[PDB]
Design a protein around this ligand. Structure first.
Ligand SMILES: CCCCCCCCCCCCCCCCCC(=O)OC[C@H](COP(=O)([O-])OCC(O)COP(=O)([O-])OC[C@@H](COC(=O)CCCCCCCCCCCCCCCCC)OC(=O)CCCCCCCCCCCCCCCCC)OC(=O)CCCCCCCCCCCCCCCCC
Ligand SMILES: CCCCCCCCCCCCCCCCCC(=O)OC[C@H](COP(=O)([O-])OCC[N+](C)(C)C)OC(=O)CCCCCCCCCCCCCCCCC
Ligand SMILES: CCCCCCCCCCCCCCCCCC(=O)OC[C@H](COP(=O)(O)OCCN)OC(=O)CCCCCCCCCCCCCCCCC
Ligand SMILES: NC(=O)C1=CN([C@@H]2O[C@H](COP(=O)(O)OP(=O)(O)OC[C@H]3O[C@@H](n4cnc5c(N)ncnc54)[C@H](OP(=O)(O)O)[C@@H]3O)[C@@H](O)[C@H]2O)C=CC1
Ligand code: SF4
Ligand code: SF4
Ligand code: SF4
Ligand SMILES: [Zn+2]
Lengths: 145, 206, 94, 95, 38, 295, 114, 176, 156, 45, 380
């Protein structure tokens, strides 16, 4: 019966994640025990997988790193952790990952991606970028009335 | 000519002929009839003729404008009668549209056309709300779009875009309060008109 | 697409349709997310001669309305009466 | 080209910085002043002058339709270089 | 049937404008000067 | 005046009042009215808070964008105080507690904390300091709350001589522990004062250069017998007619201090309890001849 | 100078409508105070009604008077049928608005507006 | 041409009447409705595992704004104010002056992201591809003030996202 | 000490329960409500996060303001906020709710719902995509994870 | 080179269904009543 | 007569007078989403006002854009090129599917049938992708503009639209299995909100509110626009004038929309997608960056905007909710002088009291749904 072939596929996900500990780690971190092909890994530790037999939308996914920029992300993962070069591939704006089509290097491009910093001391605070418009007269420092 | 909208002379002639037809039948009320270059017919009437003219166009066998597509007002402050009242009507029998226009000022009532079209009910409430034109013999004339107690008629050309009052929740009185409007960034007025004439055909005589 | 043969039979029977032919989940039939560059055509006004703008200036052919009567024989309708619609032959009745 | 003031606040590329008695710098307490540290004035100055053999050269900023509108730069003066008004690249007529 | 009204037309009370923005304002009526740049 | 704090606008939400105020104790009963009035006219308000940020949320709508700034602080950490006041032109101290806790007794809350704020403010160069004391503050009181107020009132004056000190009676208002306190009950004369009157006086004291160095007493227009007050409260609440320290204070007759300026000297007209009692006590009605005033 | 009237053909007829509207408003205030659970007194509500009428006492155009009565009836309808909420009724009193100074010197100190 | 949606006579023969009685009494049409929901229970759901999986987007996607540079690092924006003029929401505020090297550059470039309608008209109007709407859509904040972007924030966005922005522009610019 | 340790674990427990069972009351004012519907729709299935599709205002923990808040509507929105049992959070979604958006200069529009109620999360966009809103809800969960109500209680 | 824009495939696309398709199912009223009464009679017996 | 201050798209305040179960009075109080759109438009150029139309019937975005574009094109005396016209018909009918799905499934969800909402909103999500691929936005595309459309279709889009369309009629079939013959659904809709043909016309109804009552009217047939005269489709007509017939009309219109989409895919022609007239439509970026004339026209079109010759037009289309029109007044400048938006739901909601006569409270939910009311366009 196919019930046996289904159960076997279930058991191969356990070995496909490196035994029970690895199978349970992805179950609790990502709520998904699917096994895919490793497309690549970014410098922050995120890993990118594909399975083209899944339906469009489920055929690409990222298992986030457990630590990024000094933050514990074992449980607290965020969509803003995906760096731009992989962002394009993960959202299917392109077919080819940065491992096959690397981005163009520029001197000014951030070498270190930052995730959403709202709510932290690194948050953006707005302010006016223009200088003072009117200069006040400063009275003399000596007396003469 | 690929980029130019094609003319339709046949429809222009038909609509012109019908425009004279209306003017001949209701000379008491019709002041002007015109057909635009994109073939839309406008009947300009004295305000006394709203009910007779609209009834004729709804009921006459050669009109049968059974559907009131829209009813609205335009504010033109330079005119003695600043408000132009526009009726847009549709005839399904003859697959045609006609526009009926009249005028009023801030103190002269217009006759409610609810007897002719039940659709007019809310349109006239909106005209009263946004422009302050009073319609006589309306079954229930009152504001429809603005806040309760709202002062003024926002769609008048001299009503400021951002109004006079704004709302916020005040904790001391534990309710929403209205206060004079202050904007962190003033709306930036732009002067866009080119100093060069664009359309000679519409030049006005000096 | 991953359903077992039994489960495909069960849901086809319950719905009464051949669901597997028209799956609502997309697979490889979708177009590639990287495409070759386009080369779009240009319009009729892309010419080097016989192309003066005053011969294709639609805005300047607009005119003020024709005043047919100003306050200063057979009856007519605004247009000919509308033609009766004809019942569809594709499927006149649901 | 980020420089700091006596109070310690970073100076932006537009020269902005709150002066000593300005209360408004309270907004940065416990947070931070966002300052971009890739000063474009310093970056364009690092680009070499381009030697050309004509009195007139054209610049489109590079990349064809991805650059800027194409302009023509006159290089008749020998005192200074020709500078593109859009991208700041410099040109010089050789010899 | 019409009536006779001789009062100067005054609608200040039915426009909803706050009193401050009627009494203290000075309207300037003019034809704009040509922009000297064109 | 530094150019950034010159007043501008029409005194509304988007205006610039020119006030940069640090309000300690901003998350309590009196703090929420003080912040509201400051934010109404476009002041910059710094709110140091000890509580969860969730508990400061009701203060956010009271200012235009950027006008309310929140900082962590600890009453025992002088650096956290310095961070909060070093940009302000006025410091308002509303820190208090109607009871003692394992971590903070009446001495910490009414003596050490106010003195530390006053000292750090003085060092940082803050020009105005407003300290709320109590009308019945007295070294020889039966209430340790009112004893600590007296000692603290002394220290604040010594540490910040130009401080404005304000001494209210028991304050009535929607979130008070006065009328609500009586309505929750299942010789002494009181002169209670309305919360909005006290708030208006504090705001005016900031704007009045004469308020510097003075001690005010904020009291209501009428004096009542405590028994007649409670009887009135029960009648208004349509109800058939706690700690040891709290009871001592409630039984302390409100002092009469004609040698001090009051609300009238700041331009505030005291609000009678009769005009605002229902505003506070309506929520106590399960769905009225006024108290007899001491003449 | 011959115009279409609204309701009234002259000031005497117009002033009858004004008096009728005032009576309706005067009798409605006590219900409004109770229904909206207002903290103002019935006297304050009636003092506010009188103040609103009194500011239009200089009108001599019967058509303007008719519109004021028409708008006053609409406002009364919104109150009686409780289409207004408490916030709308209390907007007449400007409780959160600070006292705007009137004399020349006070205005001079605060800003540039007259 | 037209058709009738609901103009049919039921058959009044005994077989047809008994068919409708059986439907009335045995709830057959209701049971047939149960069959359809049963078949959906056994279909694979359409849910994706966000944030580990993401919805598909295209290079044209209009997200968070950014200010771009030339390859040399010079700013592309030359303070022409075409974007400010076109902005339907008046979300852009610009001041400019000659830079110390004579360049025409901005001293203020603000976008109120809470006025912005994310319409993309600014990036159409820009003659030098300086202001773009980038691919980022995950930038919600805890405060209103964080969404009032000044030039430093927008330049930082450009330096942060340029790798992806350039590739997206490379894919769509022939349609522009 | 253990007393601090017990407080730290209890805060984790109550925070985990509250962020794991976020029941929203959605004020579907305008177009932003459509993207909110697409977040409940099958592709994103907010219910799978513990966010039930539509809760009653009295059983709600988060108010989502999804559209333009007009002046006429402002009192009603504040009334629903005041009836929410605590803890209660507000998510402002879209430019209109954030700061007025396209209608910021209108006479009839409140310039940001944060003039009427305190706001925990601002979701940018016009409208924000369903995914962007889901990002905002997840951000609110992380905010609740950071709460230390019991730790602050015992240091009082 | 040649113009390349999104176009339908040469010859067009395949046919697309749009007409309502609610197929007939089940037995007639007579048979259904017969099975129901048959069940009752066996149950009673 | 009991009175309720609120009973049952946006937010509505319904003041109803009841007598037992029966509704005696139904007084809708709208304006809860009035945002002064028509006034704001007076401060915008014609291009700047285009995005306001996405936010009216914000379920039918591109149909709203089409109506405004047609009105401006008529005043300009220009015409969009044929490919733009076919794209506009193609996405107008995709938009009709978007609207009718929302209209029918939220109508069902309001009276307890919650499941078809989920099935069909996955189809909506897929059409949101077609919007995003042509415009970069899922809803407020701002894609249809006076003079044509903003950009050409990306390569490969038409194939995916074909793939979606090939399977969609089966999704309608599953929707019909849940509702069409369900006796509970019929009990909630049959003989509810009956409107006679004469009353419908005089109350200003349009769209399915007319055809449900037997009137043979559809502006795509009688007063056709961009290329509707070149596609074949049937107009569904009701016989009872009730909610159930109007439900059937909407479901059949979805089928006819697919039929139109199939023809647009096959007859899509080559060419440019906006009028080859750079005093109206902006030039291509490559031209703007090389030719002096193109750069001037780009600069002027995005700052001042094009001037529109003075005049006034009432232009209407058969939007998914009925007749949607604008009365647009030009004063000759580059900003409209007046723009009145005729929203079909305005007249329809004005007829709620009439239609609710003799019905119970729960029928008011059904009647509001059958009218398909979005308060973005009612309130404007
Ligand atoms: C009744 C329940 C029957 C139990 C057997 C179910 C089963 O094994 O079917 C799976 C199998 C796969 O179904 P599918 O829809 O084709 O899935 C597509 C892919 O193959 C999906 O497979 P895949 O390609 O994705 O392979 C990978 C996947 C493959 O997944 C598996 O490994 C199968 C795991 C199922 C095990 C269930 C054990 C059942 C224990 C019974 C007690 C619990 C119920 C009470 O691996 C996993 O993800 C494993 C995750 C573990 C999930 C938890 C399973 C345990 C649940 C019970 C916990 C009790 C403690 O189904 C069948 O082959 C049909 C036989 C089952 C009879 C179905 C009768 C339906 C009811 C009749 C109609 C009346 C309606 C009222
Ligand atoms: C009766 C008492 C039952 C207590 C149940 C405790 C729940 C355990 C739990 O928190 O789930 C794991 C969770 C999982 O962590 P998580 O909630 O951050 O989940 C991360 C994974 N995603 C991104 C998918 C959400 O553990 C924790 O969150 C740490 C806090 C523990 C709270 C309980 C402490 C006691
Ligand atoms: C030999 C001698 C023998 C003598 C005895 C012979 C008796 C056998 C022949 C008689 C058969 C009796 C059938 C009993 C079931 C009840 C029948 C019934 O009441 O149906 C009619 C009812 C209303 O019908 P309606 O369409 O509204 O029109 C009638 C009003 N004009 O319609 C309904 O009730 C519809 C139900 C509405 C609820 C829908 C939700 C439930 C649908 C799923 C149910 C699944 C089946 C339940 C099985 C339970 C198992 C435990
Ligand atoms: N209310 C009255 O009847 C009268 C009050 N006063 C004085 O007015 C001031 C305010 O009164 P009220 O507002 O009613 O007091 P509340 O108790 O209402 O508010 C107290 C404030 O003090 C803060 N606070 C208390 N203890 C500490 C602490 N240990 N460390 C840091 N912050 C602390 C609280 O912050 P948190 O919320 O974080 O604890 C809160 O913001 C007090 O000084 C009070 O004594 C004087 C006369 C009458
Ligand atoms: S996207 Fe539109 S609204 Fe936002 S800044 Fe650009 S032009 Fe203005
Ligand atoms: S971003 Fe572009 S359009 Fe805007 S001012 Fe700079 S160069 Fe001009
Ligand atoms: S922010 Fe945009 S999508 Fe949301 S309600 Fe406002 S206009 Fe509509
Ligand atoms: Zn260059």
């Amino acid at each position: 019966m196919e019930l046996l072939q289904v159960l076997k596929r279930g058991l191969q996900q356990v070995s496909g994640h490196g035994g029970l500990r690895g199978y349970l780690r992805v179950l609790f971190r990502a709520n998904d025990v699917r096994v895919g092909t490793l497309v690549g890994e970014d410098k922050y530790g995120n890993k990118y997988y594909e399975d083209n037999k899944q339906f469009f939308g489920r055929h690409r996914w990222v298992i986030y790193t457990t630590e990024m920029n000094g933050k514990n992300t074992f449980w607290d993962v965020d969509g803003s952790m995906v760096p731009p070069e992989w962002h394009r591939w993960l959202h299917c704006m392109t077919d080819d990952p940065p491992t096959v089509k690397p981005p163009t290097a520029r001197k000014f491009i951030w070498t270190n991606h930052k995730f959403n910093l709202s709510g932290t001391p690194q948050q953006y605070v707005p302010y006016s970028t223009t200088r003072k418009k009117i200069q006040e007269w400063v009275p003399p420092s000596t007396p003469y009335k | 000519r690929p980029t130019v909208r094609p003319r339709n002379d046949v429809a222009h002639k038909q609509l012109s002929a019908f425009g004279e037809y209306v003017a001949e039948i209701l000379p008491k009320y019709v002041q002007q009839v015109q057909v635009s270059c994109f073939n839309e017919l406008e009947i300009c009437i004295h305000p006394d003729g709203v009910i007779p003219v609209l009834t004729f166009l709804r009921d006459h066998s050669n009109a049968q404008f059974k559907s009131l597509a829209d009813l609205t007002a335009v504010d033109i402050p330079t005119r003695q009668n600043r408000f132009e009242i526009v009726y847009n009507l549709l005839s399904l029998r003859f697959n045609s549209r006609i526009r009926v226009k009249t005028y009023t000022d801030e103190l002269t009532p217009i006759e409610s056309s609810v007897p002719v079209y039940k659709a007019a009910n809310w349109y006239e409430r909106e005209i009263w709300d946004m422009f302050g034109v009073f319609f006589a013999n309306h079954p229930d004339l009152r504001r429809i779009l603005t806040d309760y107690g709202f002062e003024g008629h926002p769609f008048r050309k001299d009503f400021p875009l951002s109004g006079y009052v704004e709302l916020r929740y005040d904790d001391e009185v534990k309710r929403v309060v209205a206060e004079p409007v202050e904007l962190a960034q003033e709306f930036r007025k732009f002067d866009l008109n080119s100093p060069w004439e664009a359309f000679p055909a519409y030049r006005q005589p000096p | 697409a991953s359903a077992t043969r039994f489960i495909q039979w069960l849901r086809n029977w319950a719905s009464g349709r051949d669901l597997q032919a028209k799956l609502q989940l997309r697979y490889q039939e979708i177009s590639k997310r990287t495409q070759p560059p386009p080369k779009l055509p240009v319009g009729p006004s892309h010419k080097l001669s016989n192309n003066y703008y005053c011969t294709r200036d639609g805005r300047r052919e607009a005119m003020p309305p024709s005043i047919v009567m100003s306050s200063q024989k057979k009856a007519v309708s605004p247009a000919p009466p509308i033609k009766r619609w004809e019942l569809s032959q594709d499927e006149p009745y649901l | 080209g980020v420089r700091t003031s006596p109070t310690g606040e970073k100076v932006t590329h537009t020269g902005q910085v709150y002066d000593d008695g300005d209360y408004r710098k309270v907004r940065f307490v416990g947070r931070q002043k966002e300052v971009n540290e890739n000063f474009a004035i310093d970056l364009i100055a690092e680009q070499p002058v381009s030697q050309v053999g004509s009195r007139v050269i054209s610049c489109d900023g590079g990349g064809g339709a991805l650059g800027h509108p194409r302009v023509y730069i006159n290089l008749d003066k020998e005192t200074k270089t020709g500078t593109c008004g859009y991208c700041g690249l410099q040109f010089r007529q050789q010899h | 049937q019409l009536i006779t009204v001789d009062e100067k037309l005054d609608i200040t009370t039915i426009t909803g404008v706050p009193e401050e923005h009627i009494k203290t304002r000075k309207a300037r009526i003019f034809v704009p000067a040509r922009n000297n740049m064109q | 005046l530094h150019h950034a704090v010159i007043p501008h606008g029409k005194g509304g939400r988007s205006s610039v009042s020119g006030i940069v105020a640090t309000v300690f104790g901003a998350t309590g009963f009196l703090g929420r009215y003080v912040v509201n009035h400051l934010g109404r006219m476009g002041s910059q308000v710094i709110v140091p808070h000890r509580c969860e940020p969730y508990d400061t949320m009701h203060l956010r709508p009271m200012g235009d964008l950027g006008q309310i700034i929140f900082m962590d602080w600890n009453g025992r950490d002088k650096d956290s105080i310095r961070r909060a006041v070093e940009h302000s032109s006025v410091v308002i101290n509303l820190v208090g507690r109607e009871w003692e806790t394992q971590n903070f007794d009446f001495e910490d809350v009414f003596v050490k904390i106010p003195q530390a704020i006053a000292q750090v403010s003085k060092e940082a160069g803050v020009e105005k300091f407003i300290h709320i004391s109590h009308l019945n503050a007295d070294i020889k009181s039966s209430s340790k709350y009112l004893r600590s107020k007296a000692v603290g009132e002394k220290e604040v004056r010594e540490t910040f001589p130009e401080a404005t000190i304000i001494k209210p009676a028991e304050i009535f208002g929607r979130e008070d522990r006065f009328l609500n306190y009586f309505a929750n009950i299942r010789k002494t004369v009181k002169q209670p004062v309305y919360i909005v009157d006290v708030t208006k006086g504090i705001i005016n004291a900031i704007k009045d250069p004469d308020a510097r160095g003075k001690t005010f007493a904020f009291v209501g227009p009428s004096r009542y017998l405590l028994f007649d007050l409670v009887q009135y409260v029960f009648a208004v609440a349509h109800r058939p007619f706690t700690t040891r320290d709290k009871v001592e204070r409630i039984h302390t007759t409100d002092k009469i201090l004609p040698h001090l300026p009051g609300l009238e000297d700041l331009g505030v007209e005291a609000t009678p309890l009769e005009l605002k009692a229902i505003e506070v006590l309506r929520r106590h009605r399960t769905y009225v001849q006024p108290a007899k005033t001491i003449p | 100078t011959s115009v279409k009237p609204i309701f009234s053909r002259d000031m005497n007829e117009a002033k009858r409508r004004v008096r009728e509207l005032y009576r309706a408003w005067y009798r409605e205030v006590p219900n409004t105070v109770h229904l909206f659970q207002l903290d103002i007194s019935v006297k304050q509500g009636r003092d506010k009604v009188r103040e609103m009428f009194k500011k239009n006492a200089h009108i001599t155009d019967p058509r303007v008077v008719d519109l004021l009565v028409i708008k006053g009836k609409m406002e009364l309808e919104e109150t009686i049928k409780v289409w207004k909420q408490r916030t709308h009724v209390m907007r007449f009193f400007h409780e959160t608005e600070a006292p705007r100074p009137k004399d020349f010197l006070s205005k001079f100190y605060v800003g540039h507006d007259p | 041409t037209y058709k009738y949606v609901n103009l049919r006579e039921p058959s009044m023969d005994m077989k047809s009447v008994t068919d409708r009685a059986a439907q009335t009494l045995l709830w057959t049409e209701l049971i047939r409705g149960l069959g359809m929901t049963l078949s959906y229970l056994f279909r694979e759901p359409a849910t994706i595992n966000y944030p580990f999986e993401k919805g598909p987007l295209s290079p044209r996607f209009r997200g968070e704004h950014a200010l771009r540079r030339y390859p040399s690092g010079e700013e592309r924006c030359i303070a022409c104010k075409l974007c400010e003029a076109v902005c339907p929401a008046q979300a852009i505020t610009i001041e400019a002056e000659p830079r110390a090297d004579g360049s025409r550059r901005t001293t203020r470039y603000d976008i109120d992201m809470t006025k912005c309608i994310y319409c993309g008209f600014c990036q159409e109007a820009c003659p030098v591809d300086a202001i773009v709407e980038g691919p980022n859509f995950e930038f919600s904040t805890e405060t209103h003030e964080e969404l009032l972007y000044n030039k430093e924030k927008l330049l930082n966005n450009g330096d942060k996202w340029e790798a992806e922005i350039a590739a997206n522009i490379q894919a769509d610019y022939l349609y522009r | 000490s253990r007393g601090e340790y017990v407080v730290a674990k209890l805060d984790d427990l109550i925070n985990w329960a509250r962020r794991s069972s976020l029941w929203p009351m959605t004020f579907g004012l305008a177009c932003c409500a459509v993207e909110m519907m697409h977040m409940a729709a099958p592709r994103y299935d907010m219910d799978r996060f513990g966010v039930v599709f539509r809760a009653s205002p009295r059983q709600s923990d988060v108010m989502i303001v999804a559209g333009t808040l007009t002046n006429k509507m402002a009192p009603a929105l504040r009334k629903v906020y005041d009836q929410m049992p605590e803890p209660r959070y507000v998510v402002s979604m879209g430019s209109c709710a954030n700061g007025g958006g396209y209608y910021h200069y209108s006479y009839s529009v409140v310039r940001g719902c944060d003039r009427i109620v305190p706001v925990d999360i601002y979701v940018p966009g016009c409208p924000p995509t369903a995914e962007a809103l889901l990002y905002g809800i997840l951000q609110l969960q992380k905010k609740i994870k950071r709460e230390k109500r019991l730790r602050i209680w015992y240091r009082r | 080179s040649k113009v390349k824009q999104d176009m339908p495939p040469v010859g067009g696309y395949g046919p697309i269904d749009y007409k309502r398709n609610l197929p007939r199912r089940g037995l007639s009223g007579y048979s259904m009543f017969a099975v129901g009464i048959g069940a009752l009679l066996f149950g009673y017996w | 007569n009991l009175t309720l201050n609120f009973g049952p798209h946006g937010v509505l305040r319904l003041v109803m007078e009841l007598s037992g179960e029966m509704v005696r009075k139904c007084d809708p109080h709208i304006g809860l989403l009035h945002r002064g759109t028509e006034k704001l438009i007076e401060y915008k150029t014609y291009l700047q006002a285009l995005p306001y139309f996405d936010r009216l019937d914000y379920v039918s975005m591109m149909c709203n854009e089409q109506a405004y574009s047609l009105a401006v094109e008529k005043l300009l005396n220009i015409r969009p090129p044929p490919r733009a016209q076919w794209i506009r018909v193609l996405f107008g009918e995709i938009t009709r599917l978007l609207n009718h799905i929302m209209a029918v499934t939220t109508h069902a969800l309001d009276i307890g049938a919650m499941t078809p909402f989920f099935w069909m909103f996955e189809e909506r999500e897929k059409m949101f992708e077609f919007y995003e691929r042509v415009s970069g936005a899922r809803m407020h595309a701002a894609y249809v503009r006076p003079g044509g459309v903003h950009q050409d279709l990306p390569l490969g889009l038409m194939d995916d639209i074909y793939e979606f369309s090939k399977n969609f009629s089966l999704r309608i079939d599953e929707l019909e299995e849940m509702l069409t013959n369900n006796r509970i659904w019929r009990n909630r809709t049959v003989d509810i909100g009956i409107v006679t043909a004469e009353d419908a016309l005089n109350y200003g109804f349009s769209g399915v509110m007319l055809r449900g009552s037997g009137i043979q009217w559809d502006l795509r047939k009688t007063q056709p626009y961009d290329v509707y005269d070149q596609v074949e489709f049937d107009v569904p007509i009701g016989s009872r004038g009730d909610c159930y017939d109007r439900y059937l009309c909407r479901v059949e219109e979805m089928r006819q929309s697919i039929r139109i989409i199939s023809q647009c895919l096959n007859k899509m022609p080559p060419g440019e997608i906006k009028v080859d007239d750079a005093k109206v439509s902006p030039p291509k970026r490559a031209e703007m960056k090389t030719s002096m004339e193109s750069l001037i026209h780009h600069f002027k079109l995005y700052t001042e905007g094009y001037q529109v010759p003075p005049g006034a037009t009432y232009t209407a289309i058969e939007a998914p909710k009925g007749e949607f029109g604008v009365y647009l007044v030009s004063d000759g400048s580059s900003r409209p002088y007046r723009c009145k938006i005729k929203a079909p739901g305005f007249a329809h909601l004005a007829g709620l009291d009439k239609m609710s006569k003799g019905h119970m409270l729960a029928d008011v939910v059904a009647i509001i749904g059958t009218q398909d009311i979005v308060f973005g366009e009612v309130d404007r």
